[PDB]
Amino acid sequence: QDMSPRQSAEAFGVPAVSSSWVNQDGSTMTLVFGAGNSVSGFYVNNAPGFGCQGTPYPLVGLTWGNFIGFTVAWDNATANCNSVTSWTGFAEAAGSDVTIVTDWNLAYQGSSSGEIQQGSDTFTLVN
Amino acid sequence: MSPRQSAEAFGVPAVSSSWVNQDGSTMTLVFGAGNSVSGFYVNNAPGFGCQGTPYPLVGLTWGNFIGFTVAWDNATANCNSVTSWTGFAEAAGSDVTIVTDWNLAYQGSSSGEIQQGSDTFTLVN
Numbered sequence: 057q058d059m060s061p062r063q064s065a066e067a068f069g070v071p072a073v074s075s076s077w078v079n080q081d082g083s084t085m086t087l088v089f090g091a092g093n094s095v096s097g098f099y100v101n102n103a104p105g106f107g108c109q110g111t112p113y114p115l116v117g118l119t120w121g122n123f124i125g126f127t128v129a130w131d132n133a134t135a136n137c138n139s140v141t142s143w144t145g146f147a148e149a150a151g152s153d154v155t156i157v158t159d160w161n162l163a164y165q166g167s168s169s170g171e172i173q174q175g176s177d178t179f180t181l182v183n
Numbered sequence: 184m185s186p187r188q189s190a191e192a193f194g195v196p197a198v199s200s201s202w203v204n205q206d207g208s209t210m211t212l213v214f215g216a217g218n219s220v221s222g223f224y225v226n227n228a229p230g231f232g233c234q235g236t237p238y239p240l241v242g243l244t245w246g247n248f249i250g251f252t253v254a255w256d257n258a259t260a261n262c263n264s265v266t267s268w269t270g271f272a273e274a275a276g277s278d279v280t281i282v283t284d285w286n287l288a289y290q291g292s293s294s295g296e297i298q299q300g301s302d303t304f305t306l307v308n
């Protein structure tokens with residue numbers, strides 16, 4: 057009874073195993089549903105006031121039904137920001153549209169030691 | 184890039200380690216290649232579903248920072264929900280602590296909802 061990649065994507069609300077998304081600040085990501093409830097893809101940060109802008113970072117997560125969680129560690133061949141974000145949220149479908157409402161936490165280096173900042177991102181499915 | 188070096192940079196001198204949070208929930212973390220973490224999580228927190236049965240976790244680390252997710256589906260119980268934790272490790276002598284915040288996305292009273300909280304994990308060994 058392992059959910060197929062296509063069954064996992066359809067339970068999320070999208071017709072295809074891969075799907076591309078944009079948030080309110082214009083960051084983009086692509087999500088790929090796999091076996092074992094897996095989520096893979098990449099994330100492109102375009103939000104102002106943050107580093108590691110404009111290049112893809114690996115993303116990994118899990119999904120069940122219309123719920124999802126995924127993490128991005130901010131290191132790639134181009135730039136490092138010494139930080140990690142996780143998003144968690146839920147998809148809503150309407151007509152031909154899909155939205156993911158998420159909250160996120162971002163661990164980063166504090167003064168003395170680590171801190172966790174928070175926020176919210178809403179992603180829309182790029183048709 | 185090596186699993187042991189990734190584990191050591193997190194603060195733990197083993198690729199496989201076992202942790203417990205303030206509410207008795209447990210997890211095993213396995214550091215793999217390229218920042219990967221994999222393992223299992225057992226929820227023993229009062230006031231939640233899906234208690235006492237292991238769920239897969241996946242995530243990533245950089246240095247002493249970590250993020251990971253658990254989908255609340257397995258052969259024993261399904262809670263139709265997902266949690267992600269994000270936070271940082273701190274190492275005091277032989278003890279190591281992970282300070283995290285989490286979000287649990289679930290089917291709420293009448294629509295999806297996201298509940299927030301904080302877990303601190305200590306190394307069991």
Ligand SMILES: O=C(O)CCCC[C@@H]1SC[C@@H]2NC(=O)N[C@@H]21
Pocket residue numbers: 079081083101102103105106107108130137138139141160162164175177
């Ligand atoms: O500045 C950093 O430490 C790394 C980049 C973080 C970008 C954050 S992740 C949450 C939020 N949503 C985005 O689309 N970008 C920011």
Ligand SMILES: O=C(O)CCCC[C@@H]1SC[C@@H]2NC(=O)N[C@@H]21
Pocket residue numbers: 204206208209225226227228230231232233255262263264266285287289300302
């Ligand atoms: O009730 C559910 O929908 C699934 C179980 C949720 C358990 C949550 S996850 C965050 C918090 N920390 C724990 O150890 N357990 C609860």
